Design a protein around this ligand. Structure first.
Ligand code: MN
Ligand code: MN
Ligand code: MN
Ligand code: MN
Lengths: 204, 215
């Protein structure tokens, strides 16, 4: 269910062995859960291929999630802890009609506070920000546009005071250590490839 | 579905408003639950220090019950305000989702929700919305059935019941509509009213659910 949300996330380039190790799912419940998911909508190419019956459904899941996030943070003045405790339950309880009215209320926002796009009117999920940090080979200065909706990742970011839409400058790209050294405001931070994968930046 | 102990408490409070003595039958018919589950629930409520039995008023709410039903009605009506005055819900979608919402959401969530609604003082049905940590005291306590004199009236409050709202919207009877009490039969206990281009006779069982303000 909410764990099929991340077969699309590892399909984002972030088989069975990839499932169990990424979303800490039970190894027998990784291959034997598929027998239910293959039935009634959603092989060659990669490990698995979801149908349009599936692609459209997860778009509504992210829609619920990010819309609620926008409401909590921007209107209710929530913080990361309260959000991580409240939002996951809210999206599990509220109806489609509820978030549809809410979408209208929020003046139809484009992005999640993390920087993720918000699909509308049954449109498939199309992320505007796709360029991650680890892919950057040239130097220069960028803006942190999008991060993933993970909790501990935001913990890491708010620890180093690295917010969304922050102006930064990439100084060193260690090609052997796969380390990206950035400078923002008054601080300097080195970022491993495993973290740079989760940071979406935009050239300036 | 899954009526919770909180819902029973709200009902007890409501009946205490509309009735002299609170019997178990009225509690069962209102909650749409069989009598055994009603009496068994009352056992769990009277045990946890909410309700005290009294063969004069039927049941009474202790300080803990009043202090809780205040915060409970606060959460319920604030959500109603938001669902309707903002999202634009109709009085049927509310019946489907509002009760589930007030069961799930946090208290801090409601505290913030009260803020973004510019601190409302009234449920769209006329109910009083208490502030944070504040006790519940209604503005409208006068029900139609207790009226003895004739004259003009303003329908100020009802409770959020589907059937009742259906009854009111059918006869084109909204909150804050004006009307005049024409006939008051003391035997049949009927209350005949006239509003605009309509006349409606209201039996005592319906009149007890209509909170009115004189003139
Ligand atoms: Mn997000
Ligand atoms: Mn998480
Ligand atoms: Mn109400
Ligand atoms: Mn009802």
């Amino acid at each position: 269910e909410d764990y099929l949300k991340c077969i699309y996330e590892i399909g984002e380039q972030e088989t069975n062995k990839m499932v169990a190790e990424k979303m800490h799912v039970s190894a027998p419940a990784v291959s034997e859960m598929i027998k239910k998911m293959i039935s009634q909508g959603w092989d060659k190419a990669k490990g698995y291929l979801l149908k349009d019956k599936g692609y459209a459904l997860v778009a509504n899941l992210y829609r619920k999630h990010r819309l609620i996030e926008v409401f909590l943070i921007h209107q209710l003045g929530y913080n990361t802890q309260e959000v991580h405790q409240e939002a996951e339950v809210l999206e599990h309880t509220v109806s489609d009609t509820f978030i549809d009215r809410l979408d209208k209320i929020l003046d139809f926002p484009d992005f999640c506070p993390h920087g993720g796009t918000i699909p509308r009117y049954g449109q498939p999920l199309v992320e505007m920000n796709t360029t991650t940090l680890n892919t950057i080979t040239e130097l220069g200065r960028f803006r942190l546009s999008r991060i993933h909706d993970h909790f501990d990742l935001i913990q890491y970011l708010e620890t180093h005071h690295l917010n969304i839409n922050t102006e930064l400058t990439l100084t060193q790209i260690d090609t052997f250590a796969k380390t990206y050294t950035i400078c923002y405001g008054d601080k300097e931070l080195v970022i491993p490839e495993n973290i740079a994968k989760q940071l979406y930046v935009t050239a300036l």
